[PDB]
Amino acid sequence: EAEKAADESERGMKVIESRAQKDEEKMEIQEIQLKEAKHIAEDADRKYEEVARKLVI
């Protein structure tokens, strides 16, 4: 009985760990995309303010 319980717990542990690792990898990719979005936002903001100042002059 104990052997059966241990094997079932082992299988559940392995599958849940695999799914967690894959979702973690995708989360890392999402963070990379967020960083790129941050950079794009900052660059565009600088563009806009510079152009507005030049237009005023």
């Binding site: 600088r46 563009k47 152009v51």
Partner: protein, 371 residues
Amino acid sequence: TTALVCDNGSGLVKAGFAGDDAPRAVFPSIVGRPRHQGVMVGMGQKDSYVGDEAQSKRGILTLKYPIEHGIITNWDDMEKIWHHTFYNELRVAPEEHPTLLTEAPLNPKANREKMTQIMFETFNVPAMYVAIQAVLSLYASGRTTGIVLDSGDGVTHNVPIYEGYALPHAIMRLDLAGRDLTDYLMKILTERGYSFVTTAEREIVRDIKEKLCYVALDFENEMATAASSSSLEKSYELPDGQVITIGNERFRCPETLFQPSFIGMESAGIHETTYNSIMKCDIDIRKDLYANNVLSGGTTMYPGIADRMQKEITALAPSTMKIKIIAPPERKYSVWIGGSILASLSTFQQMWISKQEYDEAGPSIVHRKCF
């Protein structure tokens, strides 16, 4: 067929087919051999990572630029960089495409001759042409006159042009550029405790310089303000944590451009070599050069430089002339856009150095009529 507009540069190699708006592949020009021993077997470890691959494995490499100041000091590495650029970043064999390299003014002849010899013997291109890096930046602005200050990463040069007639006696080439600013920033960061020494950490200091530094409109007032308040201290997160806070190092790093005495150079800043370059020109084209001052190159992207330079020149110049500084938003790739435009012209199609011509006169053909 289409022409390959390569642009060696010094710090970023920019390449792409002629007739587009932006270079297809832009990647640092560094070749870094591994320096540690390596214990994993069969990992597939190469002997030299070039281009953008060595900016990701830079933790265990010793990056070394193959171009010091415009000139090329390590021909094998430069050949490796070109081979990578042709085969992996563009994936077009050079046997079927003309090439248009770019070269700084006043460079040694042997550099240019070796460049053409390599392009004709190793890569075996159909025809290649070498152009001065400032005329292209003038093409991209859509002008035909103007004095262009192309402050790259290797060397800053200032070529005045009028009505399409370049003035060879008024070119003022100065060797202060982005790399010296990186070294000076890395040297003044030590005043707070942060020590960057490794050739890999020079890249981190370069990133700090790009993201934080700016050119002050008035230097003394900024030095006084940063020494009293704390509204300037901007923080930045290293590649491992331990954020750092940059104080008045922000506008002191790029100030070296206008006072080259900071890094011990004798010459005058980029604000006064432009005025000197103008004053060497004839007395009747000085108004047009004053009104059409063009900025280009990467290092002229500092926030607030197009105002400091205009203020300085207006201080130097006579009070009646109008001083205008053209600073297009696409400054970094201005030279390459101009190169694409020049390569796309029909009138230019017969200026290439055809291979049979090189076979008849040797590599010294480049100094001849086909310039």
